[PDB]
């Protein structure tokens, strides 16, 4: 959308932030222009250490003078890498923690009807959670990395062009010759990466369907050919993944083969300009190296321009809610204040529409009147919009044409502290702020005393139930310290809206929690607060209103009738049908925020986003998403268990380990020839310097064709090895998912969109966990080892000093690689308690705006941001000092080697070019060694969070389908029998729909288990085939128990028909041959013409060929049912399990099942469950299920003959249409 500029993100800066962005900007220029000064000092040293080969006294002076200048360069990097980290990390905190304090004052002042849950308060909660971390990521510390590497580029061309300007043009005109050779590798590599994502989307829908339709995959035993369809379309991503490793051996080979043919260009012309007497050997080290790493340092300044554009995009959305001027405000000057209110609210000609969609007209010419000290009611029977009455006296909205008078004063002339202080609100599922149960009661009145809270808890039936909790009124209600998690809370607005002592008391439909003896206690609690208070009762169920003096009924825009309930029950005028309607009778936001973070977890770093959940009913839970360090849960043998699964490819790793050792020989051979030409440039013979610099160019060319054949063996192999491992894991993951129980799929984190990504992104990061961490270990250990064998043969006295110095060299470079990603570290974990307070004063804003609790949520937010700021003062002074002190042990420790090496030469032990070769080889080696020890924790710490998918492989199923020591199934005649069985779902095990259940079905009969308003009837057909096991008892079929049989050999003669049918992504020839494997063309036509749809399917373009499941022709609900019955008649089952529930016929003039119900019963055993009192005339028997038992049994000639029973009440529900 729109965007701010990059400036005005700094608009929350005070005069102490203009002082930290000034010191930390001078400190980043001086830190930047110091690597092109190391190349000016190490160049001028060699001109004194190497021109003085015949004067062994000048050598000691002109090295001890320049080895003091590395301690002075060490101090300037010490106190200027401290100033670009401690100033840009702490001044990026103080500016974004003053954006949080003003964005939250803005979202406490907007109108309360702005938040109507339709992904409006799912962006406000998301903008305070993530858009504030993107502003901080932009402006804090990636601004100092911009100035650091931009000033090196500017100062690599001023050191480079003053020493020798003809070699600072040759070593700059090579840089377009390399970045173009490497910008064609990274173009074609994305083009094969994009085709691999497209090739998996064909096989990405087979796992998508067979997890979503898992009731049909198990019922028709076809969980073996859901693999053979999957394991034939994975094989088109494997072969496309082979030639994305050959585009990487040819991309790193032909980049290190041009860069090694470009030192040969610029070390030749450096060796011509010396022979003409224009440069020397230290003005050609300065000119070449300061103009290459100066030019290369633009690839790091422009790496930070991605975060600067996400920062401008996110920071607009914040800066447009801050200055959005609202409508309903408080006027401290244009406001009144009455005295002795009475509570006479009269909606006198009030019309109103919802400003989200102005189409309907809720209150066209609405009129009611509220007396003082009385109890009125507002009740409808449908969507009258009656709960808008309590949402309008609050002034959450405005009547767009009308007026509302409080004791004869229009309420648009009243300030919102004389109004909301007089109105107490009790609502649906009331907001419990995660504090004590003493501070929640003190929102109705902020500070009076202690004994009035006990008085207010006494007249609410609450004084007893919070002393039988083992803490003295101090109980954290958010997290389960003591579990007062009952459905009967003290509905603590009943305790709040008495302590406040309101004059007008607006109740609501505060009985929606499966009313029982517990909800009868709060009913007689509400009947003692309604004394002398002009209360309304928005009521949905009429049972709670039956003893009230005056009741008013509204139906469409206006009141219809008023008066007592002795004349309201009279005349039958639009109330007698409503009591007939009484006789015939959050978790969304945590899912919405995860999908909104869906789409962008593809990239944001893991230290910057969240993972959202509900937790308990205290708040919305926000785990920092850097939960991988805390997790540390892989099996302890996991690196050995992935090498056993990837060991039929042993010839593709014995041939790949002789391609990764040969690549370690190019490191030191670069640094032996380059340190042999520093010696050559100081000859005094100008023809033995010519024919010895030809033969160091021919090695640079021959090692630019050795680096093409040795990166092609390392990368083509080890990608044949790692792509037969992602393919083998994917076939082992889906074959283990389709073995579990059905209740495992019913859980909240096992829907077929979070579990089909574990086969796509969690099985594709096993390639980069056991194949790309042996390539860079065999390479980096054969270069560490071959440069400590050379260095002890050239000279062993200096190279023993570099062994003791070697921890001080690999630690200075370990810190120079953490600095490229930043030292702040997991900034989404400190700002997590702050957001859970900001994220509960948005979704509970109906209860924050009432009670005038808007200056208390801002106090709990500003008194708590002091913890993430003192965490960042202690970190930025410590991390900026340990980084600035490890750099003094890099330059101060190369001053010791070059002094002790220039000590032995004056005593005649060593020579020149025995000290330089040892110095150049062992320092370039130390950069690679501090990369093996940077991927060292991930090898130990459980791989990572996505290499820890053994939870689908190492998981034990509850219901085991295939057993060898189980009795097989040959012929089931049908002897359905239940003994004493009780059963509950594992999703909510408190509900106990079965309680000692009993049935008995003989062979060759039917069963017609009745509706009873959905009294847990849709679980008998979920136990004839083992979708669920019973908790206690047996299920007897054919005289044998059901937990003794081969389950795959049983379900091929028990075939159901689903509630709402579903169709796979194939033609209508495999969607009706899915339940007979085998059938070809004779009994496919015959099984069509039973519930026919045959002239329906004869009219079709490609015969019987069209995709009908998805991405094809869209059929109707009356035609999908005629497909699914063609399945269940080709299979020829013996125990037919029909199904109807929840009014899903979806067809007028029903005939698609009427042909089925009379034809398909004629030789089978059927179990028909339906909620309607029709079509269930199974002429053999019919039982009535109530409360987990049967109450009456007998067919439709002895079940209607009895006078009442329980079936005749459902016979009265026939004519209630």
User: For the stretch 267-294, what's the b/e string if a residue is b when 16 or more beta carbons lie within 10 angstroms of its beta carbon?
Assistant: beebbebbeeeebbbbbbbbbbbbbbbb
Contact assessment for residue 559 and residue 368, using Cβ atoms and an 8 Å cutoff? yes
Contact assessment for residue 923 and residue 706, using Cβ atoms and an 8 Å cutoff? no
256 marked as binding residue: yes
746 marked as binding residue: yes
| Nearest-angstrom CA–CA distance, 275 and 273 | 5
The experimental method, as deposited, was cryo-EM
1018 marked as binding residue: yes
Contact assessment for residue 574 and residue 560, using Cβ atoms and an 8 Å cutoff? yes
DSSP state of 967: B
DSSP conformation letters of 92-122: THHHHTTTHHHHHHHTTTS-GGG--SSSSTT
At residue 60, φ and ψ (nearest 5 deg) are: -75, -35
| Nearest-angstrom CA–CA distance, 37 and 171 | 18
CB atoms within 10 A of CB 415: 16
263 marked as binding residue: yes
| Nearest-angstrom CA–CA distance, 797 and 915 | 10
| Nearest-angstrom CA–CA distance, 578 and 575 | 5
| Nearest-angstrom CA–CA distance, 400 and 759 | 54
- Helices 806-818 and 915-932 cross at an angle (nearest 10°) of 50
Contact assessment for residue 991 and residue 982, using Cβ atoms and an 8 Å cutoff? no
Report the 3 state secondary structure along 813-874.
HHHHHHCCCCCCCCHHHHCCHHHHHHCCCCCCHHHHHHHHCHHHHCHHHHCCCHHHHHHHHH
Q: Kind of pairing, strands 559-561 and 552-554? A: antiparallel
| Nearest-angstrom CA–CA distance, 773 and 761 | 18
Token pair 């919802």: residue: 354
Contact assessment for residue 141 and residue 89, using Cβ atoms and an 8 Å cutoff? yes
Q: Kind of pairing, strands 1035-1037 and 1040-1041? A: antiparallel
647 marked as binding residue: no
The encoded tokens of residue 967 equal 């009795």
- Using DSSP, state whether 331 is helix, strand or coil: coil
Q: Kind of pairing, strands 1183-1186 and 366-367? A: unpaired
Q: Kind of pairing, strands 1165-1167 and 1135-1137? A: parallel
Range list of H helices, 850-1001: 854-857, 859-862, 866-886, 888-891, 894-904, 915-932, 936-940
283 marked as binding residue: no
CB atoms within 10 A of CB 1031: 12
Contact assessment for residue 726 and residue 203, using Cβ atoms and an 8 Å cutoff? no
739 marked as binding residue: no
Residues facing 981 on adjacent strands: 997
325 marked as binding residue: no
Angstrom distances, CA of residue 321 to CA of 95, 325, 465, 539, 875: 18, 9, 43, 36, 32
The class of domain 1060-1132 in CATH terms is alpha beta
HSE-CB at 478 with a 13 A cutoff on CA atoms is 14
Q: Give the closest residue to 233 by CA, choosing from 209, 207, 194.
A: 207
| Nearest-angstrom CA–CA distance, 327 and 53 | 87
Say what the alpha-carbon torsion angle 278, 279, 280, 285 is, to the nearest 10 degrees.
Answer: -160
| Nearest-angstrom CA–CA distance, 1120 and 1152 | 10
Q: Kind of pairing, strands 538-539 and 378-379? A: parallel
Contact assessment for residue 129 and residue 875, using Cβ atoms and an 8 Å cutoff? no
DSSP state of 127: I
CB atoms within 10 A of CB 816: 16
Q: Kind of pairing, strands 504-506 and 1183-1186? A: unpaired
943 marked as binding residue: no
DSSP state of 234: S
Do 341-585 and 1060-1132 show the same overall fold?
yes
Say what the alpha-carbon torsion angle 574, 579, 585, 586 is, to the nearest 10 degrees.
Answer: 80
Contact assessment for residue 674 and residue 263, using Cβ atoms and an 8 Å cutoff? yes
Q: What share of the chain is helix, strand, coil (3-state, %, to 5)?
A: 35, 5, 55
In CATH, 966-1055+1141-1147+1164-1217 is 3.40.640.10: no
The encoded tokens of residue 120 equal 């409006």
356 marked as binding residue: yes
Q: What is the CA radius of gyration of the chain?
A: 40
386 marked as binding residue: yes
1017 marked as binding residue: yes
| Nearest-angstrom CA–CA distance, 727 and 199 | 14
Q: Kind of pairing, strands 994-1000 and 977-983? A: antiparallel
DSSP conformation letters of 495-531: HHHHHS--SEEE------S--SHHHHHHHHHHTTT-S
HSE-CB at 659 with a 13 A cutoff on CA atoms is 21
The encoded tokens of residue 203 equal 């096989």
Ramachandran bin of 1194, using left for φ above 0, alpha for ψ from -120 to 50, beta for the remaining angles = left
Report the 3 state secondary structure along 462-482.
CCCCCCCCCCCCCCCCCCCCC
- How many helical (H) and strand (E) elements, i.e. helices and strands, does the chain have? 56, 19
| Nearest-angstrom CA–CA distance, 220 and 1124 | 12
Contact assessment for residue 1181 and residue 1000, using Cβ atoms and an 8 Å cutoff? no
439 marked as binding residue: no
Q: Kind of pairing, strands 345-351 and 1183-1186? A: unpaired
Distance between first and last Cα of the chain = 52
Question: Which residues neighbour 823 within 8 Å (Cβ) at sequence distance 6 or greater?
Answer: 85, 89, 141, 875, 876, 879, 880, 883
CB atoms within 10 A of CB 483: 9
Token pair 């020579």: residue: 911
DSSP state of 443: G
The encoded tokens of residue 889 equal 């042990």
Domain 341-585: give its CATH code.
3.40.50.300
Contact assessment for residue 62 and residue 50, using Cβ atoms and an 8 Å cutoff? no
Hey, where are the domains in the chain? 185-263+649-780, 341-585, 966-1055+1141-1147+1164-1217, 1060-1132
Residues in the chain: 1217
HSE-CB at 682 with a 13 A cutoff on CA atoms is 19
985 marked as binding residue: yes
Resolution (A): 3.4
| Nearest-angstrom CA–CA distance, 1026 and 1061 | 20
| Nearest-angstrom CA–CA distance, 227 and 504 | 66
| Nearest-angstrom CA–CA distance, 325 and 37 | 55
Q: H-helix or E-strand containing 40?
A: helix 35-46
| Nearest-angstrom CA–CA distance, 1029 and 1044 | 12
Q: Kind of pairing, strands 504-506 and 378-379? A: unpaired
Q: Give the closest residue to 367 by CA, choosing from 557, 506, 534.
A: 557
| Nearest-angstrom CA–CA distance, 1115 and 1062 | 11
- Chain centroid to CA 721: how far? 31
């Amino acid at each position: 959308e729109q965007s701010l500029p990059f400036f005005k993100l700094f608009s929350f800066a005070d005069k102490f932030d203009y002082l930290l962005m000034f010191v930390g900007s001078l400190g980043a220029i001086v830190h930047g222009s110091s690597m092109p000064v190391f190349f000016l000092l190490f160049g001028q040293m060699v001109n004194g250490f190497g021109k003085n080969q015949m004067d062994l006294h000048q050598m000691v002076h002109e090295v001890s003078r320049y080895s003091l200048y590395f301690v002075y360069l060490g101090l300037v990097v010490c106190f200027s890498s401290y100033a670009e980290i401690a100033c840009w990390m702490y001044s990026g905190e103080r500016q974004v923690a003053a954006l949080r304090k003003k964005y939250l004052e803005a979202v406490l002042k907007q109108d309360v009807g702005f938040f109507d849950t339709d992904a409006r308060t799912g962006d406000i909660v998301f903008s305070v959670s993530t858009d504030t971390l993107l502003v901080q990521d932009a402006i804090s510390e990636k601004v100092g990395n911009f100035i650091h590497y931009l000033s090196t580029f500017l100062a690599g061309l001023v050191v480079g062009f003053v020493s020798a300007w003809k070699l600072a043009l040759l070593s700059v005109a090579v840089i377009p010759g390399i970045a173009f050779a490497g910008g064609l590798y990274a173009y074609t590599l994305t083009g094969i990466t994009s085709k691999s994502r497209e090739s998996y989307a064909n096989a990405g829908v087979i796992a998508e369907q067979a997890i979503a339709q898992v009731r049909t995959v198990y019922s028709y035993v076809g969980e073996s050919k859901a693999l053979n369809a999957y394991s034939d379309a994975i094989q088109y991503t494997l072969k496309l993944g082979y030639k994305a490793g050959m585009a990487k051996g040819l991309g790193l080979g032909c980049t290190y083969g041009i860069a090694c043919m470009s030192w040969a260009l610029v070390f030749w012309y450096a060796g011509v300009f010396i022979r003409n007497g224009q440069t020397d050997g230290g003005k050609a080290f300065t000119a070449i190296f300061s103009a290459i790493v100066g030019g290369m340092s633009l690839g790091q300044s422009f790496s930070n321009l991605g975060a600067f554009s996400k920062g401008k995009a996110a920071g607009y959305k914040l800066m447009e809610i801050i200055n959005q001027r609202p409508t309903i405000i408080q006027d401290p000057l244009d406001g009144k204040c009455l005295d002795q209110v009475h509570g006479n609210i009269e909606f006198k000609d009030v019309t109103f529409s919802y400003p989200s969609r102005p189409d309907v007209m809720i209150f066209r010419n609405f009129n009611i009147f509220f007396p003082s000290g009385k109890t009125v009611a507002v009740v409808g029977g449908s969507g009258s919009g009656k709960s808008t009455v309590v949402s309008l006296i609050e002034r959450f909205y405005d009547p767009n044409s009308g007026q509302i008078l409080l004791d004869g004063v229009e309420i648009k002339t009243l300030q919102l502290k004389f109004l909301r202080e007089q109105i107490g609100l009790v609502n649906q599922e009331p907001a419990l702020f995660a504090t004590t149960i003493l501070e929640n009661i003190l929102y109705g009145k902020p500070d009076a005393t202690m004994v009035e809270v006990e008085a207010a808890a006494s007249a609410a039936n609450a004084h007893s139930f919070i002393t039988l909790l083992p803490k003295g009124y101090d109980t954290q209600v958010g997290e389960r310290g003591v579990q007062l998690s009952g459905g009967q809370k003290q509905r603590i607005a009943i305790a709040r809206a008495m302590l406040k002592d309101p004059k007008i008391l607006l109740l609501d439909e505060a009985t929606s929690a499966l009313d029982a003896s517990s909800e009868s206690i709060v009913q007689e609690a509400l009947d003692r607060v309604m004394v002398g208070r002009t209360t309304v009762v928005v009521a949905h169920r009429l049972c709670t209103i039956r003893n009230v003096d005056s009741i008013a009924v509204i139906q469409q825009g206006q009141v219809v009738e008023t008066g007592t309930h002795e004349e309201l029950i009279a005349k039958s005028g639009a109330y007698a049908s409503l009591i007939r309607f009484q006789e015939m009778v959050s978790t969304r936001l945590s899912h919405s925020l995860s999908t909104k973070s869906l789409s962008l977890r593809s990239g944001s770093l893991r230290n910057l986003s969240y993972s959202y959940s509900t937790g308990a009913d205290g708040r919305i839970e926000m785990i920092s998403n850097a939960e991988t360090d805390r997790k540390t849960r892989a099996p302890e043998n996991y690196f050995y268990r992935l090498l056993k699964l990837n060991s039929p490819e042993w010839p593709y790793s014995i041939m790949g380990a002789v391609g990764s050792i040969l690549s370690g020989f190019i490191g030191p051979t670069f640094a032996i020839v380059m340190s042999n030409m520093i010696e050559v440039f100081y000859y005094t013979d100008y023809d033995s310097m010519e024919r010895k610099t030809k033969e160091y160019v021919f090695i640079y060319i021959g090692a630019g064709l050795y680096a093409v054949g040795a990166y092609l063996i390392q990368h083509y192999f080890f990608s044949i090895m790692g792509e037969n491992l992602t393919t083998r894991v994917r076939r082992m993951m889906l074959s283990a998912i389709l073995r579990n129980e059905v209740g495992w799929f019913d859980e909240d984190e096992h829907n077929s969109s979070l579990i089909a990504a574990r086969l796509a992104t969690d099985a594709a990061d096993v390639k980069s966990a056991i194949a790309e961490r042996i390539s860079v270990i065999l390479q980096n250990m054969t270069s560490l080892l071959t440069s400590f064998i050379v260095a002890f043969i050239v000279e062993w006295r200096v190279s023993l000093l570099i062994l003791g110095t070697f921890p001080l060299l690999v630690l200075a470079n370990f810190a120079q690689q953490l600095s490229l990603k930043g030292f702040a570290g997991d900034t989404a974990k400190a700002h997590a308690k702050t957001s859970m307070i900001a994220g509960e004063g948005v979704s509970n804003i109906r209860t924050v705006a009432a009670f005038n609790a808007q200056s208390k949520i801002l106090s709990l937010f500003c008194h708590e941001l002091r913890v993430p700021q003192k965490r960042s003062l202690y970190r930025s002074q410590t991390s900026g000092f340990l980084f600035g002190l490890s750099q003094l042990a890099l330059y101060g420790s190369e001053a010791l080697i070059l002094w002790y090496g220039a000590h032995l030469v004056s005593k005649g032990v060593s020579t020149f070019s025995k000290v330089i070769k040892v110095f150049v080889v062992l320092v370039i080696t130390a950069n690679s060694v501090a990369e093996t020890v940077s991927l060292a924790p991930e090898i130990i710490r459980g791989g990572e969070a996505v290499g820890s998918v053994f939870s689908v492989l190492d998981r034990q199923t509850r219901i085991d389908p295939d057993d060898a020591d189980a009795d097989p199934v040959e012929t089931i005649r049908g002897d359905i029998e239940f003994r004493h069985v009780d059963f509950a779902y594992p999703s909510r095990p408190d509900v106990m729909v079965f309680r000692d259940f009993n049935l008995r079905i003989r062979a060759g009969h039917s069963q017609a288990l009745v509706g009873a308003s959905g009294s847990g009837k849709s679980s008998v057909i979920a136990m004839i085939e083992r979708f669920y096991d019973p908790l206690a008892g047996k299920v007897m079929i054919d005289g044998k128990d059901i937990r003794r049989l081969n389950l795959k050999s049983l379900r091929l003669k028990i075939g159901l028909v689903q509630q709402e049918p579903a169709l796979f992504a194939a033609t209508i020839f495999d969607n009706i041959a899915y339940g007979k494997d085998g059938a070809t063309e004779s009994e496919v036509i015959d099984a069509a013409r039973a519930a026919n749809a045959h002239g329906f399917i004869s009219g079709l373009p490609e015969g019987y060929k069209t995709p009908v499941g998805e991405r094809g022709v869209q059929l109707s609900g009356g035609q999908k049912q005629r497909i699914a019955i063609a399945r269940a008649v080709l299979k020829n089952p013996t125990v037919l399990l029909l199904d109807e529930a929840t009014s899903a016929l979806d067809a007028e003039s029903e005939c698609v099942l009427q042909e089925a119900l009379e034809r398909l019963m004629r030789g089978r055993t059927t179990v028909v469950v339906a909620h309607r009192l029709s079509t269930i005339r199974g002429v053999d028997c019919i039982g009535v299920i109530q409360d987990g038992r049967i109450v009456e049994q007998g067919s439709h000639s002895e079940l209607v003959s009895r006078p009442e029973g329980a079936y005749s009440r459902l016979l009265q529900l026939q004519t209630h249409r």
